[model samples]
Target: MTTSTLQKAIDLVTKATEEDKAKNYEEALRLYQHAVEYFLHAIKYEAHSDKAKESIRAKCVQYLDRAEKLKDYLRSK
Candidate 1:
C-alpha cells in the first residue's frame, strides 16, 4: 500500500511536469497539489522509516512550493 501510494504520487508529479511544459499551469498546479497530498499521506502512515518519511516530506514541500508559485503566477496573469 505504501509503495502504491508513493508510485501514485510519482505518477502525478510526472503528469504535472508534462502539463507544466505544455503551459497548462492550472492543470499542473492541481496535479502538483494532489501529489503533495498523497506524499503527506504516505509520510504520515505509510513510510517505513524516519529517513523515508523525511524524504517524502521533502518532496511534499517541493511540490507544494511549486504549486503555490504556479497559483501565484496564474493569479497575476
Candidate 2:
C-alpha cells in the first residue's frame, strides 16, 4: 500500500511534468501541490530512518521550488 501510494504520487508528478511542457501552468501547479502533499503523507508510514526521511523530504523541496517558480512565471502571463 505504501509503494502504491508512492507510485500514485510519482504518476501525478510525471503528469505534472507533461502539463508543464504544454504550458498548462494551473494544472501543473495543482498536480505538483497534490504530489507533494501526497508524498509528504506517504512518508509518514516510512519504515526507514532519518537518512531516508530527509532524502525523501529533499525531493519534496525540489517540487516545491519548481512549483513556486512556475507560479511566478504563470503570474506574469
Candidate 3:
C-alpha cells in the first residue's frame, strides 16, 4: 500500500491504543473499529485478492472481539 494509507492505519491504531490505555473504552472501541476499516482498505488496495480480503476480514473480527471484551470490562466498572 501507499505509505500515506499505511501511515493512516498506524495512526488510527495508535490513537485507539492511547484511548484504551486511558480507560476511554467507548471512544477506544470506535477508534479501533475505524482502524480496522482503514487496515482492511489498505490490505484490499495492496493485495486485491479473495484470500487477502478474507484475511483482512478475519483480522478485523479478531480486533473487534478484543474491543468487545474491553467494552464488557468497561461496563463492569
Candidate 4:
C-alpha cells in the first residue's frame, strides 16, 4: 500500500513535469502541490524505514521548491 502511494506521487510529479515543459505553469503548480501532499501523507501514514523516509522528505522539499518558484513566476505574469 505504501509503495503504491509513493508511486502515485511519482506519477503526479512526472505528469507535472510534462505540463511545465509545455508552459502550463498553473496546472504544473497544482500537480506539484498534489504530489507534495501525497508525499507528506506517505511520510505520516506509511510504514517505511528511516532512510526511505528521509529520501521521500527530500523529494518533497524539491517539489515544493519548484512549485513555489512556479507560483511566483505565474504571479508576475
lDDT of 3 by residue, 1-25 (tens): 5567656766776787898889788
Q: Which ten residues in a row have the lowest lDDT in candidate 3?
A: 1-10
Residue 65, model 2, lDDT = 90
Candidate 1: segments with Cα more than 4 A from true spot: 1-3
TM-score of candidate 2 versus the correct structure, residues matched by position: 0.83
Off by over 4 Å in 2: 1-3
Which rank order by TM-score, best down to worst?
A: 4, 1, 2, 3
Please provide, for model 2 over 1-77, each residue's C-alpha lDDT reduced to its tens digit, 9 standing for 90 to 100: 45576787788889899999998998999899888987788788854688878877998889999888878989999
Off by over 4 Å in 4: 1-3
Each prediction's RMSD to truth? 2.2, 2.2, 3.3, 2.2
Instruction: Name the runs in model 3 displaced over 4 angstroms.
Output: 1-3, 48-62
Task: Report the lDDT tens digits of candidate 1 across residue range 6-40.
Answer: 89899999999999889899999999999998888
Candidates 2 and 3 compared by TM-score, better number: 2
In angstroms, how far off is 40's CA in candidate 2? 0.8
lDDT of 4: 0.93
RMSD of model 1, in Å? Answer: 2.2
